[PDB]
């Protein structure tokens, strides 16, 4: 039928099959002008309906709109005038074919729809959609063909049709211009994000993120300038969506579980599929489309080889094939990037929807299930389980995209070689089994590695925190070896694990060559008729390279799904747990009473004995009643039942109004004191001040360093029981509720503060004089000022009555009211916390193992190592003692590192390793040239002319070259492993000796947290991931370099393209790293908050639920999640930006190569066009891998830099010098000071000045003074802890300066101010140096009155001790340090005021012991008990750093003076 419509033939061989070939103006003016129209017509109504339903306000008109409308109008008028001219040309006696009638009319019809659809878009967000943007591309691609034919026809010399050509040419141009104009964003400039408003091209090449790329390059970027996340992902939206389906599923699962077996089994997985099936479908379609291109390239490569093999062909074939290869690569990359983006976005959505839902359940779960779990366990649950589920949802489509890819690949190989292909596959299948046996061994080793690493850190924390005591007694040398033993014991396991990992990389590295040698040898040797040729060989190599990945990622995917199974099972127990029952507390306005108990009976457990039994009482409003009883009576249980935290058994409770809670164990949040007192309330001034003053929290607040705005909590000043109780009471009284349930709020405070609080806050005349008060107490001091008292016994009420009535009853109250009341004095003080902010990770900026397939082994290990390391830190309980707020306040008053690391490794081995890797690359190029020659050999011979000698020679050499390649790699890997284990040893050892020898200034300025982190995190980083990246980068670089030598060697001209693309590569490279690095940090800083908040709320749930303050905390958690969800996307998109740019560069560098071998084909063979393209086909992704891998080693080298800084910290005076003292130097206790002047730090002034005193032998001296007089400095001046800015100290005629450092301390003894006990055994604390024998030790405890405890202990001197002697009680901790100093029996003893916490009897013993034992010695004591200072031969007085009075105490008191005035103030005599 088409023959009469048109006039020419549709298709004839003569049209083609010629040097010059072209489709006729019949095929081009038919199907090529029907496809574009069909797309627009068929698909128009769907887009019209999609706009119709969602029509909103019109947007302001912009210049682009009018340009796009006027160009279409020009097209319309052009088509109209063409139709008019055609109709006017021939009317009479001219059967003009309808191709000149329909085609003109068709276009005129379409342009109208284009005008309409464009206007409709003006009413939507994205103006330039995908519909028109794809239509224009289709039209241009279809119309390019008419162009060539038309031009040629005219150029050839025919002038018959010139209007049509000119008309068509004008339209084709205007189409180009319209397509160009249809790419501009034309933004409304919405500050949220430009993702919603972006044309098709911008949203497909990611050329809208680049703004941030320009912003972060100039100046560092903060959280302000990162675009917000879209509404579809906001936490509030995701939760509701997931909650609907969760609620709908669980109930059905519960019903199914109840119907049978008469705890759900599988509901979470379904709830997720039913919620997010649509994204799954879209991603599946995109992955299916991409999977096709993976096998398209090899066919074009075979066509190129065939075309270049012969000579009598046409150029058009080669040019068309090159263009097709370019287009296929571009399309495949564009589809793959979009699929990656969709999948990763879905993963993030799932992770947020699980984390927020877990948080929301945590604060509504029953008490039984909550008490079953642990505080840290639930935090680890959210921090680990949710992350595991994110990974298994980032790489699930692989499962189906493998069993298909593999199958397809196998099919092709068979259609290319024959039954021989099976031989290669089998060798490529046997590898996986072997890989497993080695992974299990690696895990087995790593477990013990982790165990030994844990203990070392436990000794490190103690020594770093208590560095003062070590210096005083000179115990530094022992701990050196004590920790080096553990270091070596760990190093051997590290070396074993390292050499095992090398075997695995070797098998995954040589498998390509092995499969090639086996397949080719079997194919050529199995039958004499078989003859190799270039196309078959090179295509087989390409398909092997394609297939090598899935068979090596499928094992990993199966292992991951196995972990996600148990992770899912654990979460479903928590998210599916029961809820607490509330059908026992009736919140009605009884009014008649604010409380009523109708024979209630509640139990803590499910069905155990009732803790509270048969309770019935009622108290009117405005009544203060006190609940008293013995220990374990059940008061707090009664108040918890009032709150409703127990399970009802029998009865009901009526409550009118709100409630307030003051728990026995005070709970404090993180933040300022003002934030804690407010607890989410509008700030006032007439009530805030009243609350603070009434709770007597004013004097203390004045003494805090920051006043009211002082950070309190885990990461700040740790207050004592006395204060934390007053803060809790102040918060409760400021919130101003109706019913107050106080549980012992006056226990930690003393008598004065307690009386003041009772008379000013809660009592007959106080702040809460109208509200009802229920207080539980243990002291009978405030009983007469109450209204009604109740005595609880065995959980039930024994007697209820007024104070006078109970006293008149004459029974239990008489005995009860004796001296039960217990008073508490000031309790300890504050405790500052050393900053330990460390959260650097290893697995970052990497989302799946599909983006960087070459390095899947290392990526998997890093994830597992990070997950394992998370638990340890959570379950660690670091015990670095603590510091007193008082003492802390006084204290306040470039490529070179790469060279350093290489020098630590050893340049001698580095040279040989580089030589080995380079030699391997040469053997690679050599093998390819042997095959290229072997394949070339075929053309000379034929089927029945191949000799046997050639057949054997062409394969023996191939085998030899493969063997050489394998050997050189193995050697390179074998040495690399050792070259590192040595580095970790020298770096740590060198660092430890230097850091352990630093002066006190450095230890005082830098917080302990920073110093200990270097010994733990960095050492782990510099001995684990570092080597993997350092060994992968060189392999990638050498592969790229080898590929380029091959292409340039074949055709020299290519050298030109190398320079330009490099300038682009190194440019595109700096940009990415200059931004990604900053986003990596932001992510870590904005994560820890979330887990901190969850831990806080879980610990303080009853207080949260007593005040009815749950919505605020839910909102806080939602904001904290939306801050991190905004930052993750900002790097998930950046990685996709780089890919489109580098995959484009990599595809361009192969397109040119192909064309350069079609213009110079004359001097080229088929095989030479094989080794050049077969390799260059896999250079696109290798660039992306190199940039990503070089963006990780650059981020990881930061470890070595830190370690180096502390290895070069200033040191103090040498331990031992040549100047030795006379034997038994401290013969007599003769000390003298000559104008001794000193300063703590060079920037600080002299603290002690003009000191001139004399110390006699066998003399007892008492140093006493005022605050800030430098009393304690005197001691820290005799142990040469500081220097000597002025003057000197002479003992036994020998200046302390001349004598060596470790030569002086040994012969001096000092009792520590705060007795500290190290871990280990009792022998280690008493004598780490094992110099003494047990016999003389056994005498020491006899003198110390401690032999009774130690003899009857579990062991003798071998008994272990926990942290800071936690197993031992306080009484012996101070006592033991007395015995420690007793063993040394030195000559000069410097005592200090350290008997403050020693009990009277013990104190007395300590005091007399000093006198009985130390008699033939000199004793200098700095003390505050002026009374105790009475027997000193000479009393020295310091004012502000100057000696004042030096005389006997009797003389000092006989003659009035500053000492006598102090004694008069003290009143000792
Ligand atoms: N959280 C709990 N879980 C289980 N049983 C508990 C719990 N708290 C208390 N009990 C049980 O109830 C008994 C009474 O505890 P409760 O704290 O009510 O007594 P109390 O007299 O108020 O104590 P105290 O005088 O020390 O404040 C305990 O000895 C124990 O047997
Ligand atoms: N670590 C330090 N860093 C800086 N200056 C310090 C440090 N320790 C002490 N000082 C300075 O030295 C002064 C004297 O401190 P020292 O403890 O010797 O005085 P003191 O009169 O014995 O104290 P107290 O009355 O509390 O027993 C401090 O007030 C302070 O100015
Ligand atoms: C598949 C397309 C899109 C790209 C691949 C190149 C195409 C255009 C080339 C590759 C091989 C070519 C064929 C090779 C040999 C012959 C036999 C001849 O007597 C008629 C033409 C015909 C059948 C050619 C037609 C064009 C052809 C199919
Ligand atoms: C708009 C662009 C993408 C169209 C691409 C095809 C163009 C560039 C091609 C198609 C047909 C080609 C022409 C075909 C034949 C000849 C005759 C020859 O003796 C000189 C080159 C010349 C004149 C070619 C020039 C380039 C040409 C016009
Ligand atoms: C399909 C899209 C993407 C690109 C289309 C490119 C087409 C139009 C190009 C690519 C290679 C070109 C051919 C290359 C060489 C010659 C030989 C010359 O003596 C006549 C023109 C002729 C025969 C060209 C015709 C046009 C041609 C076939
Ligand atoms: C993007 C696509 C559509 C256009 C670019 C295709 C390029 C590679 C094509 C288009 C026109 C082609 C040229 C057209 C005409 C001739 C003359 C002929 O005697 C030798 C080949 C030569 C010199 C062609 C080489 C290849 C060529 C330059
Ligand atoms: C097996 C191992 C020990 C071989 C050692 C390879 C050495 C020579 C290689 C591996 C990693 C390389 C570094 C990788 C990254 C960069 C960042 C770039 O901006 C400058 C070069 C620099 C700094 C490289 C210098 C050379 C380097 C240190
Ligand atoms: Mg209690």
Author numbering: 1 to 262, 305 to 935, 963 to 1538
What does the paper say about this structure?
Multidrug resistance-associated protein 2 (MRP2) is an ATP-powered exporter important for maintaining liver homeostasis and a potential contributor to chemotherapeutic resistance. MRP2 is a single polypeptide comprising of an N-terminal transmembrane domain (TMD0) and the canonical transporter core of two transmembrane domains (TMD1 and TMD2) and two nucleotide-binding domains (NBD1 and NBD2). Using cryogenic electron microscopy (cryo-EM), we determine the structures of human MRP2 in three conformational states: an autoinhibited state, a substrate-bound pre-translocation state, and an ATP-bound post-translocation state.
